[PDB]
Design a protein around this ligand. Structure first.
Ligand SMILES: NC(=O)c1ccc[n+]([C@@H]2O[C@H](COP(=O)([O-])OP(=O)(O)OC[C@H]3O[C@@H](n4cnc5c(N)ncnc54)[C@H](O)[C@@H]3O)[C@@H](O)[C@H]2O)c1
Ligand SMILES: NC(=O)c1ccc[n+]([C@@H]2O[C@H](COP(=O)([O-])OP(=O)(O)OC[C@H]3O[C@@H](n4cnc5c(N)ncnc54)[C@H](O)[C@@H]3O)[C@@H](O)[C@H]2O)c1
Lengths: 266, 266
């Protein structure tokens, strides 16, 4: 197994919710963490609050809209300049908005790809890095349909195909970078609350009760549980292209795509 | 079964390759077809050539970049103004380009969503339409990884999640619109040739032989075979949210997601 202690992590959407859980779990495991978020106030407050549990030198906050490509490039550069290295990238920022759905794709999918590629720019052995791990936040919505969130579902499916593909490319390139995704069920955060608002649901707002019924039936995961999954991916050297599911029913487990790579051609 | 004769189809990327096969198959079945493409010359030549087999009044050509949202809206309006109705939308335009990958997402995914939503704007029973069918071109790359085409793979996975989701939403809304996707193996067109060019493959150009080897092993489908799949979807009233695969091994067949909708939560 890989030891987390002393590694440098860049976590997007780290100011709150699952991102903040990731930052906390990483810090407890001895990592240094660059918290990256577009929410300036929540980001600064998050770092300030973390000073009480962790030495201030363990964290850095950088304000960044992940969908602004020059902003995101500048952010990676500042992180590497500050900590001297990059070992773990977590592309976690995401939103739910079926009304302004183009922006949802830009944040949820386009920015996961752009951040992944910047991670490879720094970490690939062939680019002068020493390898590392990139973890992309998908959802169960990356594997099954969501009638009330078709664009969110598209963005999450996008992450699964991209991640499995980039993981194979990394093997071919001998970049030493492992790429995995996490697909949680419902988690207790601000994204879950957005299903109540026409601002976020648009034409789908009338059907929101179907989601609420699901949440009542299956229950809600605590963000730390998702962080346990992240740590698992980081520590297990054999996981590349893994699609990790996390649910109330089965806890941490994996999508099984079988042992026949070209199944669908056969 | 639904009869194709007399229905009005809008086919994007209709100037060549699979889109043109779709237009030809639809015309033979008695449909009227709006051929939509950004390639002005190939589009005009395509309509001109089709006059030899079909009455000129069966076709309309409209130049349109599907990624330009105002252009695409204007295009739907011109189609409905011309033919008086819209029954079949085929979001088929797509590209392969891992270098300019943001544009690939805009064309392959964003424009499929934008066109789908415009199809629903016209065809939904709740918007004053009478229902219809929307067919989105995915690929086997929508269901399995492609090491040399991770963004193309992301775009195609996006279409599968979006399509299955929008199909469920249509049921909830009683829009009378069926939404399905087609996932072919390799097909003999200009997209297949693009794997040879660094312009289109970027960082993945060195690994192109792995794709070529696959093509040699599994063989190549003729575009008319894909058009047979399209006609099947249009004529079979029971197909909604179907993910149709078309391969040299099995011909036309379907991805089976099983009879347990919430499997992944259980
Ligand atoms: N909460 C759930 O039920 C659930 C389930 C599955 C997957 N997810 C995924 O988990 C990830 C984190 O979401 P969350 O539930 O913690 O939601 P959240 O709203 O609580 O946290 C998201 C964070 O991302 C930040 N962010 C959003 N857009 C950004 C941008 N453009 N640039 C920089 N920062 C941005 C926000 O400011 C916020 O701090 C998302 O990708 C989400 O899709 C959540
Ligand atoms: N050829 C294959 O092996 C294969 C396999 C699976 C899926 N597909 C999918 O089939 C669909 C059609 O591709 P094809 O193989 O016939 O390729 P093609 O290059 O031969 O035809 C694509 C057509 O789309 C048009 N187009 C591209 N971008 C456009 C835009 N922005 N606006 C308007 N028109 C645009 C082109 O001008 C062209 O006429 C694509 O979505 C492709 O991803 C192809």
């Amino acid at each position: 197994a890989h030891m987390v202690n002393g590694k440098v992590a860049l976590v997007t959407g780290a100011a709150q919710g699952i991102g903040r859980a990731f930052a906390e779990a990483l810090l407890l495991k001895g990592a240094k963490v660059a918290l990256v978020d577009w929410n300036l106030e929540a980001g600064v407050q998050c770092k300030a609050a973390l000073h009480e549990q962790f030495e201030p030198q363990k964290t850095l906050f950088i304000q960044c809209d992940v969908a602004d490509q020059q902003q995101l490039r500048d952010t990676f550069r500042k992180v590497v300049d500050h900590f001297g290295r990059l070992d773990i990238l977590v592309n976690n920022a995401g939103v739910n908005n079926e009304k302004n759905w183009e922006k949802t794709l830009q944040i949820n999918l386009v920015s996961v790809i752009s951040g992944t590629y910047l991670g490879l720019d720094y970490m690939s052995k062939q680019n002068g890095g020493e390898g590392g791990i990139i973890i992309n936040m998908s959802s169960l919505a990356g594997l099954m349909p969501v009638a009330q969130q078709p664009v969110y579902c598209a963005s999450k499916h996008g992450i699964v195909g991209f991640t499995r593909s980039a993981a194979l490319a990394a093997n071919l390139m001998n970049s030493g970078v492992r790429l995995n995704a996490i697909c949680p069920g419902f988690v207790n955060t601000a994204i879950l609350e957005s299903i109540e608002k026409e601002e976020n649901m648009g034409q789908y707002i009338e059907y929101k009760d179907h989601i609420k019924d699901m949440i009542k039936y299956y229950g809600i995961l605590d963000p730390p549980l998702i962080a346990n999954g992240l740590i698992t991916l980081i520590e297990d050297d054999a996981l590349n292209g893994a699609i990790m599911k996390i649910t109330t029913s089965k806890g941490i487990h994996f999508q099984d795509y079988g042992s026949k790579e070209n199944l669908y051609f056969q």
